[PDB]
Amino acid sequence: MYLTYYFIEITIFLAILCTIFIISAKNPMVSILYMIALFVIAAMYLYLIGLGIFSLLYIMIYIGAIAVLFLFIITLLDINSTELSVKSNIRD
Amino acid sequence: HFHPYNTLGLATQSAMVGLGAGVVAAAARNSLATGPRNILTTFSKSGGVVTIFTGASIAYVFTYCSAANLRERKDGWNHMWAGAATGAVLGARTKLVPAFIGWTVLCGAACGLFGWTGARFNADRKASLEQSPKGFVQEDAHQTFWEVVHRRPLSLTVEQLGEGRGINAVPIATATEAP
Ligand SMILES: CCCCCCCCCCC(CCCCCCCCCC)(CO[C@H]1O[C@@H](CO)[C@H](O[C@@H]2O[C@@H](CO)[C@H](O)[C@@H](O)[C@@H]2O)[C@@H](O)[C@@H]1O)CO[C@H]1O[C@@H](CO)[C@H](O[C@@H]2O[C@@H](CO)[C@H](O)[C@@H](O)[C@@H]2O)[C@@H](O)[C@H]1O
């Protein structure tokens, strides 16, 4: 019964974790896929708080239009990217 | 009247604050820069910023509190002496005597002009024209600051200006009267 208590805190931790894989990922579109995962974690939190309507509005609008737009850009365009080297961001 | 200051307490508070500002500005100098920089070049290629913040903080607040304590009043001169000490600390980084003298004199004059206008960036609420009594006095009263009158008391003129030059407690006419 009390296994269903910490869910909100779990999503918070899970959401935290997801952002570290967004800002540090070798391929770009893999990190945009982690952002899609972060929208899913948000919609989990919005069902979990009591707003079941919004969760499906997020999956419709953000995931299904904005992320599809982003992936569609990254496909047929040229973007250089450098890896998360320790030497360039240890100064940050 | 007034209350004396804790020079040691205010000085060590400012020393902690200047240490913190030095660390923040050193990190901002690393991260906004070029070339090969690591975690240990924070205090290596720092440009000596933490010495600037630390020395300026300690010198200004120590000279301000010491000058306010030996004069036993708080006015705009204490900011002049404290700003002169700040200019001495900032001017010793350029290891030249006429530079140093210029930094002291001009920083002390600028900080004294600051501290004479109230030593506040923002406004004072009760002292401004808009929140103070203005215009003529309605009846006879002590004319406060920002107020106009037609005639001033002559006793006030003798007390404020003096008993000397062309100025007297009795006009020169009725001092020379036939009876
Ligand atoms: C053109 C050449 C450049 C000249 C620059 C001007 C700056 C000159 C400032 C002078 C002036 C503004 C007048 C300027 C108007 C013309 C402005 C001209 C153009 C402006 C560009 C600011 O006077 C400041 O003087 C400072 C020291 O000198 C003080 O520093 C601070 O000290 C510590 C104290 O608490 C601080 O704790 C500390 O934080 C600071 O250290 C400040 O308190 C004060 O605000 C005077 O304002 C003040 O005067 C006093 C009189 O005594 C008046 O009190 C009146 O009189 C009494 C009963 O008779 C009664 O008390 C009262 O009933 C009555 O109200 C006030 O009404 C008030 O208004």
Q: Residues lining ligand 1, judged by CB closer than 6 Å?
A: B 74-76, 115-119, 124, 127, 132, 144-145
How many Å apart are CA A52 and CA B14, to the nearest integer?
53
Q: Tell me, in Å, the resolution of the deposited structure.
A: 3.2
Query: Which one, of B92, B83, B18, lies nearest residue B57 by Cα?
Result: B18
Q: Identify whether the C-beta of residue B67 lies closer than 8 Å to the C-beta of residue B77.
A: yes
> Within 10 A of B135 (CB to CB), how many other CB atoms are there?
8
d(CA B169, CA B84): 43
Say if the Cβ atoms of B30 and A87 lie within 8 Å: no
Specify the amino acid at residue A55: S
DSSP secondary structure letter of residue B75: S
Q: How was this structure determined?
A: cryo-EM
Residues contacting B51, CB < 8 A, separation 6+? B22
For residue B81, the 8-state DSSP code is H
Measured distance CA(B102)–CA(B83) in Å, rounded:
12
Residue B78: name the closest of B8, B86, B100, B103 by CA. Answer: B86
3-class SS of residue B135? strand
d(Cα B101, Cα B88) in Å, to the nearest integer? 8
CA dihedral B46, B52, B53, B56 (to 10 degrees): 180
Distances in Å between the Cα of B121 and the Cα atoms of B56, B114, B115, B146, B171 are 19, 9, 10, 21, 46
DSSP character at residue B78: H
Longest dimension (CA), chain A: 52
- CA-closest residue to ligand 1 atom 65: B145
Would you tell me how many other CB atoms lie within 10 Å of the CB of residue B31? Answer: 12
Sort out which chain B residues have CB atoms less than 8 A from A92's CB and list them.
30-31
DSSP per-residue string spanning chain A: -GGGSSHHHHHHHHHHHHHHHHHS-SSHHHHHHHHHHHHHHHHHHHHHHT-HHHHHHHIIIIIIIIHHHHHHHHHTS--------HHHHS--
Q: Do A92 and B31 touch (CB under 8 A)?
A: yes
Nearest CA to ligand 1 atom 13: B117
